[PDB]
Design an enzyme around this catalytic site. Sequence first.
Site, mmCIF file in Angstrom:
data_model
loop_
_atom_site.group_PDB
_atom_site.id
_atom_site.type_symbol
_atom_site.label_atom_id
_atom_site.label_comp_id
_atom_site.label_asym_id
_atom_site.label_seq_id
_atom_site.Cartn_x
_atom_site.Cartn_y
_atom_site.Cartn_z
ATOM 1 N N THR A 1 24.976 -21.281 -38.895
ATOM 2 C CA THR A 1 24.905 -21.612 -37.469
ATOM 3 C C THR A 1 26.236 -22.135 -36.922
ATOM 4 O O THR A 1 27.092 -22.613 -37.666
ATOM 5 C CB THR A 1 23.844 -22.695 -37.186
ATOM 6 O OG1 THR A 1 24.303 -23.958 -37.677
ATOM 7 C CG2 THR A 1 22.507 -22.353 -37.837
ATOM 8 N N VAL A 2 26.384 -22.035 -35.604
ATOM 9 C CA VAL A 2 27.486 -22.647 -34.881
ATOM 10 C C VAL A 2 26.871 -23.603 -33.874
ATOM 11 O O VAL A 2 25.982 -23.218 -33.112
ATOM 12 C CB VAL A 2 28.348 -21.593 -34.143
ATOM 13 C CG1 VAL A 2 29.421 -22.260 -33.282
ATOM 14 C CG2 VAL A 2 29.000 -20.649 -35.138
ATOM 15 N N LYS B 1 31.110 -24.567 -37.034
ATOM 16 C CA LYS B 1 30.454 -23.615 -37.922
ATOM 17 C C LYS B 1 29.898 -24.382 -39.120
ATOM 18 O O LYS B 1 30.656 -24.993 -39.867
ATOM 19 C CB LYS B 1 31.448 -22.540 -38.386
ATOM 20 C CG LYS B 1 30.835 -21.470 -39.293
ATOM 21 C CD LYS B 1 31.845 -20.400 -39.681
ATOM 22 C CE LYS B 1 31.229 -19.353 -40.586
ATOM 23 N NZ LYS B 1 32.211 -18.302 -40.971
ATOM 24 N N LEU C 1 24.606 -23.071 -30.686
ATOM 25 C CA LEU C 1 25.202 -22.000 -29.889
ATOM 26 C C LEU C 1 24.710 -20.632 -30.345
ATOM 27 O O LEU C 1 24.532 -19.725 -29.528
ATOM 28 C CB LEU C 1 26.733 -22.046 -29.987
ATOM 29 C CG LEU C 1 27.400 -23.253 -29.318
ATOM 30 C CD1 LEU C 1 28.800 -23.480 -29.854
ATOM 31 C CD2 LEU C 1 27.427 -23.091 -27.811
ATOM 32 N N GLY C 2 24.513 -20.483 -31.654
ATOM 33 C CA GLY C 2 24.038 -19.227 -32.230
ATOM 34 C C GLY C 2 23.927 -19.294 -33.742
ATOM 35 O O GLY C 2 24.335 -20.282 -34.357
ATOM 36 N N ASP D 1 38.419 -8.060 -38.644
ATOM 37 C CA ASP D 1 37.126 -8.102 -37.942
ATOM 38 C C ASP D 1 37.365 -8.205 -36.448
ATOM 39 O O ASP D 1 36.710 -8.974 -35.748
ATOM 40 C CB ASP D 1 36.286 -9.273 -38.472
ATOM 41 C CG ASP D 1 34.797 -9.123 -38.204
ATOM 42 O OD1 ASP D 1 34.364 -8.101 -37.633
ATOM 43 O OD2 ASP D 1 34.064 -10.064 -38.563
HETATM 44 C C1 LIG Z 1 28.786 -15.846 -31.200
HETATM 45 S S1 LIG Z 1 27.913 -17.398 -31.469
HETATM 46 O O1 LIG Z 1 28.712 -18.323 -32.235
HETATM 47 O O2 LIG Z 1 26.681 -17.126 -32.181
HETATM 48 N N1 LIG Z 1 27.586 -17.982 -29.971
HETATM 49 C C2 LIG Z 1 28.473 -18.752 -29.177
HETATM 50 C C3 LIG Z 1 28.151 -18.969 -27.842
HETATM 51 C C4 LIG Z 1 28.995 -19.688 -27.019
HETATM 52 C C5 LIG Z 1 30.182 -20.191 -27.505
HETATM 53 C C6 LIG Z 1 30.517 -19.970 -28.835
HETATM 54 C C7 LIG Z 1 31.752 -20.460 -29.420
HETATM 55 C C8 LIG Z 1 32.660 -21.267 -28.755
HETATM 56 N N2 LIG Z 1 33.800 -21.666 -29.401
HETATM 57 C C9 LIG Z 1 34.040 -21.278 -30.716
HETATM 58 N N3 LIG Z 1 35.223 -21.716 -31.310
HETATM 59 C C10 LIG Z 1 33.121 -20.494 -31.387
HETATM 60 C C11 LIG Z 1 33.270 -19.985 -32.763
HETATM 61 O O3 LIG Z 1 34.298 -20.151 -33.387
HETATM 62 N N4 LIG Z 1 32.208 -19.273 -33.257
HETATM 63 C C12 LIG Z 1 32.194 -18.640 -34.583
HETATM 64 C C13 LIG Z 1 31.635 -17.233 -34.365
HETATM 65 C C14 LIG Z 1 32.640 -16.358 -33.590
HETATM 66 C C15 LIG Z 1 32.001 -14.991 -33.291
HETATM 67 N N5 LIG Z 1 31.399 -14.382 -34.501
HETATM 68 C C16 LIG Z 1 30.578 -15.245 -35.374
HETATM 69 C C17 LIG Z 1 31.316 -16.549 -35.700
HETATM 70 N N6 LIG Z 1 31.989 -20.091 -30.718
HETATM 71 C C18 LIG Z 1 29.675 -19.245 -29.666
#
Ligand SMILES: CS(=O)(=O)Nc1cccc(-c2cnc(N)c(C(=O)NCC3CCNCC3)n2)c1
Length: 263
Positions: A19-20, A35, A15-16, A121
């Site tokens: 890493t996630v 994560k 996702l990004g 944050d």
């Molecule tokens: C922004 S991404 O993760 O690179 N892209 C990204 C793109 C699309 C969906 C998600 C997503 C969906 N569900 C989640 N439960 C999380 C989640 O907890 N992510 C952790 C990050 C939250 C934002 N700041 C960095 C930590 N993420 C993250």
Amino acid sequence: VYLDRKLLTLEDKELGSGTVKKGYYQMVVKTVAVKILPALKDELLAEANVMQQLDNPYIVRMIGICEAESWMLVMEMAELGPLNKYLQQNRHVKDKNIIELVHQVSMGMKYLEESNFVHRDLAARNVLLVTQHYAKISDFGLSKALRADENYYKAQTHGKWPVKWYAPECINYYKFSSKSDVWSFGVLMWEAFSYGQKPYRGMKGSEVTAMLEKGERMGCPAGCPREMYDLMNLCWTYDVENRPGFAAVELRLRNYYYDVVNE
Ligand SMILES: CS(=O)(=O)Nc1cccc(-c2cnc(N)c(C(=O)NCC3CCNCC3)n2)c1
């Protein structure tokens, strides 16, 4: 708390990026966000310890932890992703819909405040969308449970801080309270009504501190209703003692939202 690695299926498409990754936890299967990772391991467990104590519809829920190839924090999936990127890509989202989402964030933060946790944050990039009409607060990596006898958390070092989101008392005294999160919430509101634009654009953190010290504040975003801009400014009250809490903030947003719904 500790999950069963056999029951976790990770996807290759990340996702990004630490890493996630998207995945599935076999309960039905629940779609999950994962994560993936000494100190960085300690941070993850601390973060998990925080999420474990929180139960509210507008906060991202932890499913659990898993230690395999790396340490993994398994959370519920917010499929539409970060609020800032969403609004950048969807510029015709209506004002009513923005108010709905920012109000949902205020309900999550009223709960966090009631729970005596500080987020530290709170920015649009950390609000995640389950749907276009359903936001959750994510990213508890800097969060702290307040001591029973204190109203704030005192940081020691100053380390990798989102300064443009931080209140004067955070910058000047290293003190973080729920009212400091309110300040952050005002910046988040500005981001949201600016359709995911970065606050204080082109400015150094130091120049932001100087600006605020002069009593100067960011202007009303185009199309942002006066009442939401007033609320932004109330969140940016310099003196923490006279800045509203999230009970006050949520109620303002609640009433305004219902009265936008009426029209
Ligand atoms: C922004 S991404 O993760 O690179 N892209 C990204 C793109 C699309 C969906 C998600 C997503 C969906 N569900 C989640 N439960 C999380 C989640 O907890 N992510 C952790 C990050 C939250 C934002 N700041 C960095 C930590 N993420 C993250």
